[PDB]
Design an enzyme around this catalytic site. Structure first.
Site: not given
Ligand code: NAP
Ligand code: AX3
Ligand code: NAP
Ligand code: NAP
Ligand code: NAP
Ligand code: AX3
Ligand code: AX3
Ligand code: AX3
Ligand code: NA
Ligand code: NA
Lengths: 247, 248, 248, 249
Positions: D13, D136, D142, D155, D157, D159
């Protein structure tokens, strides 16, 4: 008579909030951690005014495995004493530096627990037991211009903004309003040196002085009052213009 | 004696409610109006029936022009002429209509930016130049960061009014003049708005699924001018029922 | 064929650096100026020596007035007449001077609100009306919530420009026109400002205790107009070395 | 020699996209992961086949606990072990799930949601700074934090705390020449667990193209922030949201 819980209410801003809520007609739960003598002296003062209208409640609000149960019991204490719980004021707070360059996990537990996780758990417990219901969180007007080396404190206060907003949204259908009051400089920390206290005071545009605790408490009173019944998710700065002053 | 307040756009709607609540709190009031002369005079008569010689009307166009400074000075002068003092200024009057990017545009600029921002600035200047609890309250908009579609000039004006609130709070603090804002979400809906549109807005508000009454907006103004707000300057209080917290 | 950009106030300082970096990136440029004709023409000559027929100049006063809409339409038109297209608009030109609450004030309003807000709005209108990677970048100010003392009209103008950025981003998104901002903190100081005064500002900046170069500001503009920013709209990038995070 | 970066949660991702783009820009990368071992190893293998000995994996749970400081120290140490330096830290890993206020333990939810989104970033920032050109840190924020999803208080809180860290750390680390910035997606890659109709509900909200950000679009803003083109930028959070946060209810 409505009832309110004020955390960290034995001294300083918490004490003034409890006093002003009681003066407005609330029965109050005076929460404390270490300041048992002061908490009971405040209750004795308030009960002398109106019998059986003030009780004390002890708890550590540091994060731990027992914090959820401790927060449930603070809310329960208000129901046991008064049969209702109309207002929650999240005032208790740890505040000290945590430089990036006590163990750090104890600092986390204390700073993030008191400023953010305990407010969250208290909010849950308050809501679960549910008129003019509201929560007021004690925020910080300087959260976006933070004190140097206060990262965990600042994180905790930012989290509390988040809780304020998230809980305002989620609790609106229950008629529970959730707002904040954000001091700039009010009663200076007891350990701060005099010269340091004066440097802060001189920065405040509106009178070159800190806020009294009562001035902070006035904004809390407004937010819990009938005159704020459409206000939720709002954070009222009570900072004398301090946050407007550039470096 | 009794303190005095200027409320702009006070003949109707939120400004009227503000004028009434200030008068009920003990203020003498200048009821500024532009076109709503009959409503303004009727409000003054109402307030004067309660306490004689405590309300006057003052007519002015607050559109931007080269005479707007003189017009704003005359509104403040009209308070001093009637009451001998001017303790509170409420910048409430406002033009509100769409200006799509894709009346002449010059008129739109003058009206939207003049009423929402320039007149508040010039009134602020005149207020400050002319003089125990002095304050200014600007009527802002809780939705300025999530603005209505095709309302660019309006939104620009309300953002400018935030800037004025902050800048004037900073500059006027040494004079003991506090400067704050009240930011409605949806309150009294536009007269022009259709019922279905009004209902759609109402249904978005988390706290009660209803718009704010004018009185609820006025309650926040009353707080900010009161003794209970004496350390508060540069603050903008949302009175929006949570509306601004709701994602798309 | 090469895209084209309009940069307002491009003869000197940050606007010049922006025009140079856009030209280096491959854009044809309209160098708008007001009083700085010799500098504008020198820049155009430099750029056309680098690549013939890639730079033109366009004179206009951006003070608010009855003729400003036509002036702004003409600036956009100049890009189409020169280059056949207008892909990027950079709203950089700006008046900046104090306006204490306590030149006539109507001229100060016209200049400060015109250059910082109304001309950007009208330029945005004309840009959109004449309409790939199309975008607008507005030069904002990282210190707008901690403003300089006695700069209320300037600050109002910059706040209004934030509102325009947001409103225009929303409204123009369906046409694929992105609208963003770059917010300097301390960048180029006045050359005539004493170094001792310059140093008071420089020492405030956490990251290096120095002002941003014009080129560092321009780097952020280049990012926002690039293919690497095609999902970014309504965003304002601070380029301030942490200055806005420093308390009083 | 080439610079080195740590990307948390980099197996898949957005985190993978960031690791890939940094690697394409010339970085050596530590691919941190928690449960996604197969994905993490696959990515490393792919990057090392492009350039030998330029990617390693590092496993850690970033849930808060009394050993989290040691775990965070060890992630940074792993970068120095493999590559001899650590120039960039990207705090991407994140737990994300609802925590309704009114009704798997709540203390576990706190530890996971606050630990991944805030405390682990803080501890990693401490370790990064203690071990030290163009240094950096980029925090994945978010864009919707002030218009949050219903029933996501913890969540949100977390972010918000991450915003606070970004700012505090930018201020405190500036004298070390370490810049600290954020990238704030709106809707990017939707959750695997979401049905297409629900994904489309979110897509339709986005003014700029009525679609989510690709992973690469998010990574593009990270790469800008770590680049020389951002050398005066610290304490800034760049929304990469297609205008989503500008849309009223
Ligand atoms: N996707 C969106 O639309 C979106 C929107 C707003 C903000 N964001 C932010 O952008 C970033 C990436 O988003 P994403 O959707 O790609 O994230 P995601 O797939 O939800 O999570 C990314 C990774 O976080 C790891 N993770 C979760 N719990 C963990 C734990 N206990 N210890 C260590 N690692 C842990 C997992 O690693 P493993 O798979 O190896 O377990 C997972 O692959 C995140 O910070 C998210 O909040 C994303
Ligand atoms: N960690 C995180 N944070 C956001 N906002 N969106 C997402 N998409 C999650 C994999 C469901 N993950
Ligand atoms: N004073 C200011 O200028 C200022 C500025 C900005 C924000 N604020 C905010 O306004 C609020 C009140 O400020 P203040 O200066 O009056 O607060 P304070 O004196 O620092 O703390 C208030 C009380 O918090 C309680 N507390 C601390 N750690 C605790 C723990 N582990 N468990 C439970 N309770 C704990 C203590 O109760 P016991 O004494 O019973 O142990 C203490 O008396 C706080 O939220 C503060 O962050 C204040
Ligand atoms: N109602 C809401 O939901 C809402 C939402 C957000 C913000 N607000 C803000 O709250 C305030 C009060 O709202 P409202 O709905 O009561 O306002 P409104 O009815 O739209 O306008 C108030 C008054 O402004 C005066 N005005 C308009 N153009 C003027 C001009 N060229 N010169 C002088 N005065 C002029 C009018 O006076 P005359 O009638 O005498 O001509 C009018 O009655 C406004 O600042 C508004 O922007 C309201
Ligand atoms: N310098 C900083 O530290 C700083 C800090 C924060 C924000 N900014 C923003 O960054 C941008 C560039 O800053 P800067 O310092 O390079 O700007 P500047 O030197 O103050 O002004 C740039 C140009 O604006 C033009 N301009 C001024 N009044 C005008 C008018 N009435 N009509 C048309 N054009 C007019 C002038 O063009 P002519 O010379 O041709 O007359 C001038 O050279 C501005 O928007 C500024 O607000 C700069
Ligand atoms: N808890 C907290 N937070 C702040 N900002 N300041 C203070 N002030 C003094 C520790 C008593 N306390
Ligand atoms: N002036 C202004 N501003 C807003 N937001 N809403 C309204 N509402 C309707 C024109 C009465 N008026
Ligand atoms: N903020 C700002 N805005 C303009 N237009 N010009 C300037 N000039 C700097 C003082 C040299 N600064
Ligand atoms: Na206990
Ligand atoms: Na000239």
């Amino acid at each position: 008579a409505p009832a309110a819980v004020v955390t960290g209410a034995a001294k300083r801003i918490g004490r003034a909030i409890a006093v002003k809520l009681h003066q407005t007609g609330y029965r109050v739960v005076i929460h404390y951690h270490n300041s048992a003598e002061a908490a009971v002296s405040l209750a004795d003062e308030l009960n002398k005014e109106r019998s059986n209208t003030a009780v004390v409640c002890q708890a550590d609000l540091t994060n731990s495995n027992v914090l959820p149960a401790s927060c449930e019991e603070i809310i329960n204490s208000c129901f046991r004493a008064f049969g209702r719980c109309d207002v929650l004021v999240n005032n208790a707070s740890a505040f000290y530096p945590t430089p990036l360059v006590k163990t750090v996990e104890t600092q986390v537990a204390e700073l993030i627990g008191t400023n953010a996780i305990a407010p969250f758990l208290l909010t849950m417990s308050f809501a679960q037991r549910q008129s003019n219901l509201s929560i007021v969180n004690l925020c910080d007007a300087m959260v976006d211009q933070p004190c140097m080396a206060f990262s965990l404190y600042n994180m905790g206060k930012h989290a509390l903004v988040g809780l304020t907003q998230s809980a305002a949204l989620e609790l609106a259908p229950y008629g529970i309003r959730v707002n904040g009051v954000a001091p700039g400089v009010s009663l200076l920390p007891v350990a701060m040196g005099e010269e340091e206290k004066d440097k802060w005071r001189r920065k405040v545009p509106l009178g070159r002085r800190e806020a009294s605790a009562e001035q902070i408490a006035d904004a809390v009173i407004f937010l819990v009052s009938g005159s704020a019944q459409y206000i939720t998710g709002s954070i009222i700065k009570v900072d004398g213009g301090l946050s407007l002053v550039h470096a």
